[PDB]
Structure formats: C-alpha cells, structure tokens
Structure 1
C-alpha cells in the first residue's frame, strides 16, 4: 500500500528522479494540515457504530425488500454479514484518510468486491446506497464546529467524500 509520501516516492523511483522542490513543498503543505486529517480520522472512528447502525437502519426502511424473508439481508447470518460489510467499508475508508492515499481502500477492500457481490446475489446498488448514507453522516461529524479549534476543513471533507464515492462506485 501507499501513504501520501510513499505514493510520490514510488513514482519518483520509476523515473529514477529525486523529488522536485515543488513536490516537496506539496508534501510540506499536507504535513501542515495534518492535525485536521487526524481529527477527521478520530471523529469518524469515535462514531463508527452509530454511523453504521443508523445508515443500515435507514437503508432498510427505504428498501424493505432487503429484510423481507427471502431478501439478501434476511436471517441473522446475513443481516450480521451485511452490517459487517458496512463496518468494513467504513474501516478502510478511515484507513485511506489516515494514510492520505486510496491504495489501502482500493487494494484490500474494493478490488474484486463487485464480483463477490455478483456471485452471492447481493445487490451492489443497495450497498452503494448504504455507503452513500455513511458518507453523509461521516462528513457531518467531521464538519461539526463544536469542541474543536475553528478552521477550514473543506479540502479534507472533499478528499474524504472522494474515498466514500470510490467505495460506492466499486459496487455499483
């Protein structure tokens, strides 16, 4: 996997180059804003199970066919499985945010997922809706002005939404 640094480093290496001082300045900038990154990781994590449970509940109300007997989330093995996936996707999104690079999320979570769902009969579009709701709730928790040093987190919010969107796209 890559973090924001080693992503740049690996690209440099295949060119046999040292980083341009422009590149280094970009990284310096990312460093200077890292407190905000870490806050976002802590906040999302600190609400993982309400993020997950709420989105799940909400999804089910919108899509009752999912939990009607016969639906993919009917029976406890399956509901459990379904909740577990929500948590997993959220886990890997937080990883990518912390590392500052989508690779962990791409490689270990999303890659091959669309095919896994197809084979199982799980409706991807539905998962994506789930992911769509977690993303909203997450961002709202990130952006909450209470209890934090006031500043602009909007670039970060934009990045975090990016990672959620990838997850949703990867199962759609």
Structure 2
C-alpha cells in the first residue's frame, strides 16, 4: 500500500534527510504525466468486461482441456470462479496503475495466490497465459486513438506491461 509520493517519502525518511531536488523534478514530471497515466486507466477501465470475456474466450479456445470434463475450469461454478479470478487480477492491475506503484498489486494478490493455485490444483500456466493475453489486449485497447489528442504512451505502455508481467510471473 504505497503511492509514488509515499514511496519517495518512505525512501527519504529511510535516508533520514529531506527530499533531494532531482526527486522533486521527477515528481513534478510525474504530476505532469499522472493525468497522462490516467487516460489509459480511464480507457482501460471502461472496457474491462470485454477484456476478461475476450481473454477467457481466447484462452478456452486455446486450451480446451480446461473446458473438457475433469478439467479445472470445467464445472459451471468453477468456470464462474475462473472468470472472477481473472476479473480480480485485472482490477488490481488497474489499481496499481492508478496509484502508480506495484506495491498494491503485490499486497493484494501476488504473495498468496501462487500458493492458493498450488493448493487448489489450479494450473498456474493457463492463468499465467490468460493474464498475459489479457495484458496484451489491454495495451492494445489502450494504445489506439479515437478522437484523442496525440501523445506519447511509451512509458505508460512500459509501466502497464510491467504490471501485467509482474502479475503473470507471480502467478506462475
């Protein structure tokens, strides 16, 4: 549970001194691009149900063993729980790119959910591939411009793909 600003504050307190000037110029540029960060969240957030349905749509086209009887996501209840797990992961990705820090995504799902999927018998590979495909579709949905001002989304495509790869690797 950390912001960008609280991250700089905790680092400056562990140093024990005041915040240096270059960190303040970095935070000024962050305050200039924080709304820019926001547009992806605004346009990432609005298409979330389409994102998770298309992600499960491609995943269960890709691995039909999960839909097959005896598969882990075969049962209707389990399949609803599967879509719930995916939607939760997408929501915490949107939270982490809202606050601009991966510590919320770590705190909320990464530490426990690997052991949860081991204990449940859930294959970590399929949900890892699903989070990867969901992240690819999320950046693909975020990057296109419709009646949108020209802008550079490279460091925020960088950051969003970082958050998605952190989620997919912590899942394993």
User: What TM-score, normalized to structure 2?
Assistant: 0.98
Q: Which residue of 2 aligns with 1:20?
A: 20
Q: What does the per-residue CA deviation read over 1:5-32, in whole Å, with 9 as the maximum and x for residues that have no partner?
A: 0011011112211110000110100111
User: SS of the counterpart of 1:65?
Assistant: coil
User: SS of the counterpart of 1:118?
Assistant: helix
Gaps of 5+ in 1: none
2: CA distance between counterparts of 1:48 and 1:37? 17
Segments ≥4 residues shifted beyond 3 Å: none
**Match status 1:124 vs 2:124:** yes
User: SS of the counterpart of 2:171?
Assistant: coil
2: CA distance between counterparts of 1:58 and 1:153? 26
Gaps of 5+ in 2: none
Q: Aligned-pair distance for 1:147? A: 2.1
Q: Which residue of 2 aligns with 1:9?
A: 9
Q: Which residue of 1 aligns with 2:143?
A: 143
1: CA distance between counterparts of 2:144 and 2:74? 35
Compute the RMSD of aligned alpha carbons.
0.7
1: CA distance between counterparts of 2:100 and 2:79? 32
1: CA distance between counterparts of 2:37 and 2:30? 9
Q: What does the per-residue CA deviation read over 1:113-161, in whole Å, with 9 as the maximum and x for residues that have no partner?
A: 1100000000011101000111111101111121211111111000000
2: CA distance between counterparts of 1:33 and 1:78? 41
User: What TM-score, normalized to structure 1?
Assistant: 0.98
User: SS of the counterpart of 1:111?
Assistant: helix
2: CA distance between counterparts of 1:44 and 1:167? 17
